[PDB]
Scaffold this active site. Structure first.
Site, PDB file in Angstrom:
ATOM      1  N   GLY A   1       0.708  -1.283  -0.070  1.00 34.98           N
ATOM      2  CA  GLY A   1       0.084  -0.237   0.018  1.00 34.98           C
ATOM      3  C   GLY A   1       0.661   1.305   0.100  1.00 34.98           C
ATOM      4  CB  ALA A   2       1.709   4.010   1.531  1.00 32.69           C
ATOM      5  CG  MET A   3       7.502   1.466   3.897  1.00 34.97           C
ATOM      6  SD  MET A   3       6.919   1.281   5.733  1.00 34.97           S
ATOM      7  CE  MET A   3       8.289   1.994   6.454  1.00 34.97           C
TER       8      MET A   3
ATOM      9  CG  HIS B   1      -0.888   7.278   7.272  1.00 38.37           C
ATOM     10  ND1 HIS B   1      -1.568   6.998   8.097  1.00 38.37           N
ATOM     11  CD2 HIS B   1       0.093   6.667   7.400  1.00 38.37           C
ATOM     12  CE1 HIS B   1      -1.353   5.772   8.795  1.00 38.37           C
ATOM     13  NE2 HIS B   1       0.017   5.428   8.131  1.00 38.37           N
ATOM     14  CD  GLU B   2       2.150   6.126   4.378  1.00 37.86           C
ATOM     15  OE1 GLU B   2       1.323   5.309   4.346  1.00 37.86           O
ATOM     16  OE2 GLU B   2       3.294   5.970   5.217  1.00 37.86           O
TER      17      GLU B   2
ATOM     18  CG  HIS C   1       4.477   7.440   9.631  1.00 40.42           C
ATOM     19  ND1 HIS C   1       4.405   6.925  11.003  1.00 40.42           N
ATOM     20  CD2 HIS C   1       3.584   6.773   9.056  1.00 40.42           C
ATOM     21  CE1 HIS C   1       3.429   6.145  11.006  1.00 40.42           C
ATOM     22  NE2 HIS C   1       3.150   5.778   9.756  1.00 40.42           N
TER      23      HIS C   1
HETATM   24  C1  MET Z   1       1.914  -3.139   6.595  1.00 40.15           C
HETATM   25  S1  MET Z   1       3.173  -2.678   5.428  1.00 40.15           S
HETATM   26  C2  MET Z   1       2.828  -1.035   5.265  1.00 40.15           C
HETATM   27  C3  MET Z   1       3.872   0.149   5.473  1.00 40.15           C
HETATM   28  C4  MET Z   1       3.552   1.236   6.234  1.00 40.15           C
HETATM   29  N1  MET Z   1       4.170   1.071   7.886  1.00 40.15           N
HETATM   30  C5  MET Z   1       1.806   1.431   6.304  1.00 40.15           C
HETATM   31  O1  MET Z   1       1.069   1.453   7.656  1.00 40.15           O
HETATM   32  O2  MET Z   1       1.080   1.614   5.252  1.00 40.15           O
HETATM   33 ZN   LIG Z   2       1.549   4.640   8.952  1.00 39.47          ZN
END
Ligand code: MET
Ligand SMILES: [Zn+2]
Ligand SMILES: *[C@@H]1O[C@H](CO)[C@@H](O[C@@H]2O[C@H](CO)[C@@H](O[C@@H]3O[C@H](CO)[C@@H](O)[C@H](O)[C@H]3NC(C)=O)[C@H](O)[C@H]2NC(C)=O)[C@H](O)[C@H]1NC(C)=O
Ligand SMILES: *[C@@H]1O[C@H](CO)[C@@H](O[C@@H]2O[C@H](CO)[C@@H](O[C@@H]3O[C@H](CO)[C@@H](O)[C@H](O)[C@H]3NC(C)=O)[C@H](O)[C@H]2NC(C)=O)[C@H](O)[C@H]1NC(C)=O
Ligand SMILES: *[C@@H]1O[C@H](CO)[C@@H](O[C@@H]2O[C@H](CO)[C@@H](O[C@@H]3O[C@H](CO)[C@@H](O)[C@H](O)[C@H]3NC(C)=O)[C@H](O)[C@H]2NC(C)=O)[C@H](O)[C@H]1NC(C)=O
Ligand SMILES: *[C@@H]1O[C@H](CO)[C@@H](O[C@@H]2O[C@H](CO)[C@@H](O)[C@H](O)[C@H]2NC(C)=O)[C@H](O)[C@H]1NC(C)=O
Ligand SMILES: *[C@@H]1O[C@H](CO)[C@@H](O[C@@H]2O[C@H](CO)[C@@H](O)[C@H](O)[C@H]2NC(C)=O)[C@H](O)[C@H]1NC(C)=O
Ligand SMILES: *[C@@H]1O[C@H](CO)[C@@H](O[C@@H]2O[C@H](CO)[C@@H](O)[C@H](O)[C@H]2NC(C)=O)[C@H](O)[C@H]1NC(C)=O
Ligand SMILES: *[C@@H]1O[C@H](CO)[C@@H](O[C@@H]2O[C@H](CO)[C@@H](O)[C@H](O)[C@H]2NC(C)=O)[C@H](O)[C@H]1NC(C)=O
Ligand SMILES: *[C@@H]1O[C@H](CO)[C@@H](O[C@@H]2O[C@H](CO)[C@@H](O)[C@H](O)[C@H]2NC(C)=O)[C@H](O)[C@H]1NC(C)=O
Ligand SMILES: *[C@@H]1O[C@H](CO)[C@@H](O[C@@H]2O[C@H](CO)[C@@H](O)[C@H](O)[C@H]2NC(C)=O)[C@H](O)[C@H]1NC(C)=O
Ligand SMILES: *[C@@H]1O[C@H](CO)[C@@H](O)[C@H](O)[C@H]1NC(C)=O
Ligand SMILES: *[C@@H]1O[C@H](CO)[C@@H](O)[C@H](O)[C@H]1NC(C)=O
Length: 902
Positions: free
Chosen positions: A285-287, A321-322, A325
């Site tokens: 999804g996203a990181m 969201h990303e 962080h």
């Molecule tokens: C669970 S893998 C996704 C990476 C990231 N920590 C998220 O909340 O999108």
């Molecule tokens: Zn997150």
């Protein structure tokens, strides 16, 4: 005494200072078809306590270092002991360097290694992603370290608290672009051994965790902006995506969002640049990699020509969201994975704040309520739930770490943090949050550190008074699972709490330090006027005149559902709320208009109100223009439709819903100017989307006509789609339902030539809405043909057909019959027998259907059920529950709908 290399947690004897890492992906298979990457690394670390062993993480790496698997040197003029032997311990994922003597406290050492691994298409560590550009399969190299996969790319002390600086170098084909956390140092230079390759060095990272590293080699291009403080912002994507302008929305919102958070956090964005990259089929999804955030394409890219408003909402919130962080999580990092909920919960909350800054007219902050609060309450109102907090010593293995990433961590985390901000006030919350970020910058924390800094802010002022310490209050919400129902007898103002479970027969076996009592912040509105705030202490029962009413008055608790609890009243108070909603709904906040519906249907499930009181709570909707209350109804009734849409109950249900939704359909008909122009803000667009879905699926002739007209219009002019992306899924579906093979075959053609995933999805789903058995069966015939339907789409499509009341027996027959294709597709890509079983059995609600699921199980005698083995038992248990719910409820519900459908 167990050997330290057989322990899952690293020793604390050696701490890393800084790493050099050079990686070289080979994007051409070695012709027996294997893709590899090669690496070299040096880690400098400091000895804290004497030890004769070096234990560092390594996963799926072969070492080609000269001599032992590592070379070990002293830094400066430190001597170094000789290596005895190096060995790999697979279970705990270690490289173990046994020494002939001890390292000495205060001394620094450098350990160098050379290694290689598979560049697998496995979305883990340094890995490859394949995608199409015209004729050509393209391959890029990219990373996903989260949580414990940095060690899969190079040997490292791979725990989040063991932060270090990183000097990354990529060696890559000279016509490809190389990206990492930091900017490149300068221009790339040719690799001397082979000038077809180039070398790109990156600037030193800040002190940072291994799980946040990223590096990518690709042909991607970017759109760019330089914020006013010189921070470079880029959005990266496939060249064709970029040329189409699909990166522009992301670019638009990124600047405002970063600006919001710098101010919100009282802390400058800690990096010189922000890259975000859209990856095709990034399943994670996203990181939030620090300075280089990765997204699946559909999460970052936006096509104005074909994308709906909800898609726009997904982009801005995922970005918020990303980026959240980049301070909370990345600058200050939770020491261990047992505290993941704080990191993910925090981002899951502030994503709405950041996005609201970027789109201030959309009222996005409201969406946390349907999106997270009521979502997570569904699973937190079960005996099988779990506390937000887990003891650190229970979370050891990579599997145990992965289990941290669930609904409770994200959505309950968000919910309780939102509650906390609200009862502190946001200004106070921000002060403590800033204090925490400044104190722990570039270091690690536990949630107790945040509580402590919030307490400092409370203690430094006189206006907000709490019934206990921040920690004591939050302990109630973090150390025990679940949440209370707060029940009010308005005759006396008696108020009570009990642990809320949906199943009134459940046995809770998880014990609580607090006997499932909470300390509850309770806002309330009386006759539309805000009352003084109230705290329910840790007692079963209390009383307050705040919650006492006269006979013509009403009270309503938990304004805007800021508190993590649900509310029940005596009947009289329910009636008064209902009357208000009937006569002037504007007196009650729109979120609470939704709440009254959400809570009452849950209360009815738990047998705390009659189901008719819940249905009564929908009666006001005929005058409701706004999104959320209607969404509450549709979410709560989807089960009723699931249970009843093949029954005598269904006619009066449809009729009632038609009655309720007609005036809203009429409203938008005028407002949109005969559907020519969408409402302006998001909430009203969502409302229009739901009103049209509801109208059409319940058989309002006006909606049915609209859908036929537009789809006829599209068919007479294929290149100019007249249907706004917001309305596509409804209008497609309804028009195919009304039509035959003409409409179906046309939409099939359009699906085969859709370039855009989201439009392909809509078409695939609409095609399942046909009311011809023979079309649905032919369609099912296609789902296992990879030429006609992508495999990753096969079970989705079967579920959509099952969703069709006419498609139900067809899909069920089809799944039973071709079940012997677990042995063609629990090896041919996962498949998800689990989701397919849930989807096709979802409706089952009779003894007869249970007898059928039982009979289908009795092909246990081989092939089994794969990843759906437990989903099958869940289906047999859920069918039992449905049979019981249908017997209890059928009579009352039929008569209510009959009564209320005019
Ligand atoms: C669970 S893998 C996704 C990476 C990231 N920590 C998220 O909340 O999108
Ligand atoms: Zn997150
Ligand atoms: C981790 O990587 C760093 C970057 O490669 C290494 O630091 C660099 O070392 C280079 C060579 O060791 C130095 O570059 C030049 O080297 C020549 C040798 O021919 C010297 O005369 C010069 O000192 C130097 N030239 C210039 C113009 O500076 C760099 O000094 C240096 N880069 C820096 C410091 O930014 C690290 O040594 C390496 N770490 C370990 C432990 O090996
Ligand atoms: C890390 O080292 C591993 C162990 O040396 C390598 O795993 C080996 O892969 C080999 C080739 O992929 C396999 O050996 C043989 O390959 C030839 C053709 O390449 C085939 O004809 C043989 O069938 C096959 N040998 C056998 C006995 O089947 C090995 O299967 C395999 N060895 C082990 C012990 O697993 C990794 O490739 C290497 N990884 C990297 C990225 O360098
Ligand atoms: C990124 O932000 C850009 C700047 O705010 C947005 O650019 C705007 O695109 C709008 C949609 O095309 C344009 O609005 C209208 O466009 C139609 C086209 O023919 C005109 O009739 C209208 O007059 C015009 N409305 C206005 C208020 O100008 C804007 O022209 C345009 N604004 C600017 C400053 O260029 C992008 O839309 C946005 N990108 C995304 C994907 O949201
Ligand atoms: C990564 O690169 C950085 C920056 O060039 C190195 O930091 C230097 O470290 C040396 C040796 O300790 C110091 O003498 C310099 O003062 C540092 N420079 C700066 C700008 O801080 C760092 O050592 C490198 N990491 C490794 C493992 O070599
Ligand atoms: C980078 O260089 C490589 C090799 O010159 C190019 O890849 C080739 O592209 C053609 C199509 O144009 C394919 O038919 C070949 O099979 C490719 N070769 C390999 C080994 O992949 C690539 O197109 C160039 N990329 C850029 C961005 O210029
Ligand atoms: C962090 O917040 C502080 C406190 O609000 C900011 O410093 C204040 O800035 C205002 C705005 O001009 C001044 O009028 C105040 O007198 C300042 N207060 C103090 C104690 O200095 C500061 O600018 C913020 N820092 C960042 C990086 O955003
Ligand atoms: C984890 O974070 C803690 C802080 O929460 C770090 O401990 C601090 O270390 C710095 C620099 O050495 C000191 O200024 C403080 O006195 C320490 N605070 C403490 C001990 O409470 C700790 O170094 C981090 N752990 C690791 C492995 O880096
Ligand atoms: C409201 O709560 C009070 C308890 O504080 C209830 O009144 C008590 O009921 C017990 C029942 O045996 C009596 O022995 C006590 O003397 C009562 N306390 C009084 C009158 O002060 C009252 O029934 C509750 N009302 C509800 C739940 O509607
Ligand atoms: C409950 O939520 C509503 C939003 O759904 C809040 O109303 C917003 O309030 C802020 C500040 O008053 C305004 O900037 C928004 O424009 C308001 N939106 C609407 C639609 O009214 C309301 O303030 C919240 N109520 C409480 C008690 O916190
Ligand atoms: C819970 O235990 C009680 C014991 O009285 C029992 O009646 C009930 O069947 C058990 N389980 C559930 C899920 O209700
Ligand atoms: C209904 O209540 C709203 C808000 O309290 C008020 O502004 C308005 O006067 C009332 N509307 C009508 C039509 O009476």
């Amino acid at each position: 005494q167990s050997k330290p290399w057989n322990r899952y947690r690293l020793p604390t004897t050696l701490l890393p200072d800084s790493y050099n890492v050079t990686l070289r992906p080979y994007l051409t298979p070695n012709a027996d078809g294997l893709y590899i990457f090669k690496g070299k690394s040096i880690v400098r670390f400091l000895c804290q306590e004497p030890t004769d062993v070096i234990i560092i993480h390594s996963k799926k790496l072969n070492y080609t270092t000269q001599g032992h698997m590592v070379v070990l040197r002293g830094v400066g003029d430190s001597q170094v002991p000789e290596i005895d032997r190096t060995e790999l311990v697979e279970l705990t994922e270690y490289l173990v360097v046994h020494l002939k003597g001890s390292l000495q406290p205060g001394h620094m050492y450098e350990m160098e290694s050379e290694f290689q691994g598979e560049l697998a298409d496995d979305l883990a560590g340094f890995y490859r992603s394949e995608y199409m550009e015209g004729n050509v399969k393209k391959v890029l190299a990219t990373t996903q370290m989260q949580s414990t996969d940095a060690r899969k790319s190079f040997p490292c002390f791979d725990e989040p608290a063991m932060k270090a600086t990183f000097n990354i170098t990529l060696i890559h084909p000279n016509n490809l672009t190389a990206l990492s956390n930091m900017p490149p140092k300068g221009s790339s230079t040719p690799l001397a051994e082979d000038p077809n390759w180039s070398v790109t060095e990156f600037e030193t990272t800040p002190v940072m965790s291994t799980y946040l590293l990223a590096y990518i080699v690709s042909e991607f291009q970017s759109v760019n902006e330089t914020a006013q403080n010189g921070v470079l912002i880029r959005i990266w994507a496939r060249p064709n995506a970029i040329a189409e302008g699909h990166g522009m929305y992301a670019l638009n919102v990124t600047g405002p969002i970063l600006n919001f958070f710098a101010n919100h956090y009282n802390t400058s964005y800690p990096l010189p640049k922000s890259d975000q990259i859209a990856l095709p089929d990034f399943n994670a999804g996203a990181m939030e990699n620090w300075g280089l955030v990765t997204y699946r394409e559909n999460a970052l890219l936006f096509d104005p020509q074909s994308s709906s408003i909800s898609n726009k909402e997904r982009v801005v919130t995922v970005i918020a969201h990303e980026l959240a962080h980049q301070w909370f999580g990345n600058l200050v990092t939770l020491a261990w994975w047992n505290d993941l909920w704080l990191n993910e919960g925090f981002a899951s909350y502030v994503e709405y704040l950041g996005a609201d800054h970027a789109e201030p007219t959309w009222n996005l902050k409201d969406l946390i309520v349907p999106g997270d609060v009521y979502r997570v309450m569904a699973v937190d109102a079960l005996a099988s739930s779990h506390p937000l907090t887990t003891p650190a010593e229970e979370v050891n293995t990579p599997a145990q770490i992965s289990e941290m990433f669930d609904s409770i961590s994200y959505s309950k985390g968000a919910s309780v943090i939102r509650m906390l901000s609200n009862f502190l006030t946001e200004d106070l919350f921000k002060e403590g949050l800033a204090s925490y970020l400044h104190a722990f910058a570039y270091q690690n924390t536990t949630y107790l550190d945040l509580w402590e800094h919030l307490q400092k802010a409370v203690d430094a002022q006189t206006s907000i008074r709490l019934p206990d310490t921040v920690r004591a209050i939050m302990d109630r919400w973090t150390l025990q699972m679940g949440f209370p129902v707060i029940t009010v007898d308005t005759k006396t103002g008696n108020i009570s709490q009990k642990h809320f479970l949906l199943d009134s027969e459940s046995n809770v076996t998880r014990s609580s330090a607090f006997d499932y009592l909470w300390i509850v912040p309770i806002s309330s509105i009386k006759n539309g006027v805000m009352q003084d705030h109230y705290w329910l202490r840790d007692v079963s029962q209390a009383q307050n005149d705040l919650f006492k009413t006269a006979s013509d008055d009403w009270v309503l608790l938990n304004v805007n559902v800021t508190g993590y609890f649900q509310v029940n009243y005596d009947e009289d108070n329910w009636r008064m709320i209902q009357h208000q909603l009937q006569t002037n709904l504007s007196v009650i906040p729109v979120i609470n208009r939704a709440q009254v519906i959400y809570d009452s249907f849950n209360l009815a499930t738990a047998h705390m109100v009659p189901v008719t009181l819940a249905l009564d709570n929908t009666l006001f909707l005929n005058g409701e223009k706004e999104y959320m209350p209607w969404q509450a109804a549709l979410s709560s009734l989807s089960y009723f439709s699931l249970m009843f849409d093949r029954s005598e109950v269904y006619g009066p249900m449809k009729k009632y819903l038609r009655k309720q939704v007609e005036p809203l359909f009429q409203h938008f008909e005028t407002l949109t100017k005969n559907w020519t122009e969408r409402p302006e803000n998001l909430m009203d667009q969502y409302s229009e989307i739901n009103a049209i879905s509801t109208a059409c699926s319940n058989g309002l002739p006006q909606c049915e006509n609209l859908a036929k007209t537009l789809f006829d219009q599209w068919m007479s002019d294929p290149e100019n789609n007249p249907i706004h992306p917001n309305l596509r899924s409804t209008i497609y579906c309804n028009a195919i339902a009304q039509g035959g093979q003409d409409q179906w075959d046309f939409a099939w053609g359009q699906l085969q030539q859709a370039q855009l995933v989201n439009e392909a999805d809509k078409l695939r789903s609409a095609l399942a809405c046909s009311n011809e058995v023979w079309l649905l069966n032919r369609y099912l015939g296609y789902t296992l043909n990879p030429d006609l339907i992508r495999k990753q789409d096969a079970t989705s499509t079967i579920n959509s057909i099952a969703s069709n009341v006419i498609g139900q027996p067809l899909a069920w027959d089809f799944v039973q019959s071709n079940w012997k294709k677990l042995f063609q597709d629990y090896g041919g890509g996962s498949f998800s027998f689990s989701n397919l079983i849930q989807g096709v059995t979802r409706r089952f609600s009779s003894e007869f259907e249970l007898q059928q699921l039982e009979q289908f199980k009795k092909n246990n005698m081989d092939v089994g059920f794969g990843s759906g083995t437990r989903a099958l038992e869940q289906a047999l248990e859920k069918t039992k529950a449905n049979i019981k719910w249908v017997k209890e409820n059928k009579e009352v519900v039929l008569n209510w709908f009959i009564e209320h459908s005019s």
